[PDB]
């Protein structure tokens, strides 16, 4: 959180093709572009009135959510705007007629519109490749 | 290239080779019905096993099961057409224990001997 001092990058950060005309004056001095990702997911009020950029944000960015939807438990928040969630499941071995505890770690991008800490339960949405290993984006936090 | 040609084996040898209770019985079936090999009896018992296997899988299924009735009717009719099964035994429970020589006696070997004009099975 803390708005991460949005303009500390070496380049200027802005939503592309979103013009704030200096000639005219009105409320909400900087125009903000946001979208509803759909699939019954509400855009948090943090994104509507925030000051972050997050090109890869699902609400105020150029990415779209489409494909698999997963649920996972947060185990890491150490990276910048990226978290790792744990996805536990049981794998069936037919020979012994019984199960096996297994897990898979999933690196997932997290927008400043969400404040997540280790131990949360979040659901994630598939997007286009975001990084070498990231293909998902956090859309809802269901814990504290 | 072209599709493979499907082929299958039509007989199975008994597990115990030298057992007198079966050795002489085999020579009995080949005795008065003119067979040159044990593979004739071995052949007949192979689909006799297959018939029983299909029949056993039918009785396991519930009554009025469409699959039980459909292939049940087909199996009961197809043996009745051949004649190895009498018309009275059309209950799908008498097909399990039909006989080992019921199939063999329906062969053209026996029919030529049954309906005169041969006066011996070896002729």
């Amino acid at each position: 959180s803390t708005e991460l001092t949005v303009q500390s990058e070496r380049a200027f950060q802005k939503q592309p093709h979103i013009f704030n005309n200096p000639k005219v004056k009105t409320s909400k001095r900087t125009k903000r572009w946001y979208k509803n990702a759909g699939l019954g997911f509400k855009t948090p009020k943090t994104a509507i009135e925030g000051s972050y950029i997050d090109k890869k944000c699902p609400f105020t960015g150029l990415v779209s959510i489409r494909g698999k939807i997963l649920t996972g438990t947060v185990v890491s928040t150490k990276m910048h705007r990226t978290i790792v969630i744990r996805r536990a499941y049981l794998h069936y071995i037919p020979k012994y007629n019984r199960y096996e505890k297994r897990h898979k770690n999933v690196p997932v991008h997290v927008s400043p519109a969400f404040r997540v800490q280790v131990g949360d339960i979040v659901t994630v949405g598939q997007c286009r490749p975001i990084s070498k290993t990231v293909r998902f984006n956090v859309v809802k936090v269901s814990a504290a | 290239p072209r599709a493979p040609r499907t082929y299958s084996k039509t007989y199975s040898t008994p597990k115990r080779p030298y057992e007198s209770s079966r050795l002489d019985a085999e020579l009995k079936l080949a005795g008065e019905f003119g067979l040159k090999n044990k593979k004739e009896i071995y052949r007949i018992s192979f689909q006799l096993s297959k018939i029983r296997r299909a029949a056993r899988d039918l009785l396991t299924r519930d009554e009025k099961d469409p699959k039980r009735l459909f292939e049940g009717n087909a199996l009961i009719r197809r043996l009745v057409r051949v004649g190895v099964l009498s018309e009275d035994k059309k209950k799908l429970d008498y097909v399990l224990a039909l006989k080992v020589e019921d199939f063999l006696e329906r062969r053209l070997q026996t029919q030529v001997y049954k309906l005169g004009l041969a006066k011996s099975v070896h002729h």
């Binding site: 759909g38 939807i69 | 290239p1 072209r2 599709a3 009735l69």
Partner: protein, 258 residues
């Protein structure tokens, strides 16, 4: 890899062509056309195996180069030209016209149709978009593009095609109660009087389908082809009328006439 493939081995063709597995290594590969590869008639199969008009592949070729066989009013003298669902295969000679309709078992059946109504076809609209210069258009299930359509035409509808000009004559909206055709899926080849569909936002819209004998079944939205209103259809259904008559009563029915 390394490029598009130009061969289609046998045992790899769609099973509804009823090509025997023996007697030849290859099967006719459909050319690129208005229909997909698996959902394809192509004429060499139809003119040789279905109608038995031609015996060999060489005399299949001879028939087309005499401009006898024409598809949808166009000659289409291609040996492996892909013919798809309800493409009007008309022959100027022998004064017979065939329509491609799925039979009860999901295979293509010969459906002779009268010349009067062999001059149109129904098309399921796939997408509706805006062309260049703001000209709306629709795309049917066989790739046709028709400009300036009725504004009320939306996705999943079916449109009657004049089959002499690119313009449209009539259309049917995709609503409950309409007579529908099953094109694809497990229930392929059935007519099913649509009842209800479940939205399933995100993907794979589903729909419930009920037979004339009250036999209901479910298939994906992509596999249903609306062909008119309940009762009177806009096309001549083939023998069987899409009932999915069971195997147990199929032997009973075929035993009646022997």
């Amino acid at each position: 890899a390394r490029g598009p493939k130009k061969h289609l081995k046998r045992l790899a063709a769609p099973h509804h062509w009823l090509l025997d597995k023996l007697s030849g290594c290859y099967a006719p590969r459909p050319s690129a056309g208005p229909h997909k590869l698996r959902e394809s008639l192509p004429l060499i199969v139809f003119l040789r195996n279905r109608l038995k008009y031609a015996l060999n592949g060489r005399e299949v070729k001879a028939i087309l180069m005499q401009r006898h066989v024409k598809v949808d009013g166009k000659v289409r003298t291609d040996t492996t030209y892909p013919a798809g669902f309800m493409d009007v295969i008309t022959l100027d000679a022998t004064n017979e016209n065939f329509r491609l309709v799925y039979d009860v078992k999901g295979r293509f059946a010969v459906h002779r149709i009268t010349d009067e109504e062999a001059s149109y076809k129904l098309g399921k609209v796939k997408k509706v978009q805006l062309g260049k210069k703001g000209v709306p258009y629709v795309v049917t299930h066989d790739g046709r593009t028709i400009r300036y359509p009725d504004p009320n035409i939306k996705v999943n509808d079916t449109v009657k095609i004049d089959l002499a000009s690119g313009k449209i004559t009539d259309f049917i909206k995709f609503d409950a109660g309409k007579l529908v055709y099953v094109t694809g899926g497990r229930n392929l080849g059935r007519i099913g009087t649509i009842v209800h569909k479940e939205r399933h936002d995100g993907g794979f819209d589903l729909v419930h389908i009920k037979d004339s004998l009250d036999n209901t079944f479910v298939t994906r939205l992509n596999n249903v082809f609306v062909i008119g209103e309940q009762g009177k259809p806009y096309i001549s259904l083939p023998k069987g009328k899409g009932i999915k008559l069971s195997i147990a009563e199929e032997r009973d029915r075929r035993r009646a006439q022997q």
